[PDB]
Amino acid sequence: ENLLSTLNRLAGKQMIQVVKWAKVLPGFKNLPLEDQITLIQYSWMSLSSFALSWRSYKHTNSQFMYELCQGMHQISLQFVRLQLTFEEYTIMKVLLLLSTIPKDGLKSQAAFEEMRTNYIKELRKMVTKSPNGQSWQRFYQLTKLLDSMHDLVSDLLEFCFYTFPAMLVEIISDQLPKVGNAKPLYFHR
Amino acid sequence: ENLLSTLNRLAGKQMIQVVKWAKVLPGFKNLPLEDQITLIQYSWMSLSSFALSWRSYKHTNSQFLYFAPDLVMYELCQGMHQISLQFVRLQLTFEEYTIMKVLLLLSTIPKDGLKSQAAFEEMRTNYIKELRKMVTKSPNGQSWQRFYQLTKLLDSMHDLVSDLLEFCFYPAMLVEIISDQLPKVGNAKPLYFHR
């Protein structure tokens, strides 16, 4: 009984710490607030898998739902193969945040597409400086890894839409709403 | 101890029922979501005063401030009771209430301006026009007169609550119901670098 509760409570501790991180990313809180929410929601499983596999690779050197956990452990091993930088994690994290959208599209697809492109360019630039042994190779791998991140979580998004709150919506809109200062509008001066 | 708790809990019951009402108003949920929130926030005391004074005039014919059927500070309540009496003077229609309510919702903004001042200014204008049209059909006893009164009444509604906005300032509930229908949660399209 106790196990599945704690992971849904750690999931919650982090989902609030993701918001705080995303809200410094350039041009995020400059998106529509509808979209901020949608983009964090849709990404979350891609985002978590990466983050978990990362802390595997960093903390216990890729040592520590076994159908489903096996994937993450497998990626954390890939991280050692690539000797992934932090830079490459934080960028690839952002990219995952922007890799899952609704088929409908977002409020401002135009704004979103610039942001994603902006970041995809950061990666491009960032691997004409940290490859191994040319740049184009490093790019092919980091990209294909981000893709396989979707495949890992491919069939487990419906199975989340169950577990998928009033918590985060508080912290996202928190800083953006702009609450003495009030200007009332009169019909006669 | 018990009194001031219940009014802050009736305030909360209504704050959620305002959201649901606003979200059918034409061109509201078409505003920025930042603005929906700001507009409901800033208006709330203008909005409540009108609504309370209205249920006075409708339910008990302007005798007691009918806070609810579950309930049939006097510096401040005196104002509302005073307005509810004005309502009888004008024999205010429901139409005139619901429109004037919307106008109050769009009558208080931050001096900074909203995310989409342009969008907001069209909305307000749109509704100010509804009034204008709506009192070239329900006056008494010419149209221009009825406008002067309903407008000056919406103004006095700001004066009534003039100094009590700080005292309100100085939640996670409504933010849930506003964004509720607007965010658009199987359907997911993941974006691949290689097909």
Ligand SMILES: Cc1c(C(=O)Nc2ccc(S(C)(=O)=O)cc2)cn(CCO)c1-c1ccccc1C(F)(F)F
């Ligand atoms: C533990 C967990 C987490 C989690 O911790 N995620 C996380 C995301 C980002 C970061 S970051 C970028 O480094 O801040 C850190 C952590 C998300 N979920 C899914 C909940 O809907 C679960 C969960 C719940 C129930 C069963 C199974 C699992 C699990 F996903 F673990 F398999």
Ligand SMILES: Cc1c(C(=O)Nc2ccc(S(C)(=O)=O)cc2)cn(CCO)c1-c1ccccc1C(F)(F)F
């Ligand atoms: C009761 C109340 C209400 C209230 O019920 N408002 C309301 C708004 C719209 C509608 S509608 C359009 O018809 O749905 C109905 C009702 C708002 N506040 C202010 C709270 O910040 C209080 C309150 C709390 C504490 C002390 C004093 C008061 C009071 F305002 F009453 F003086």
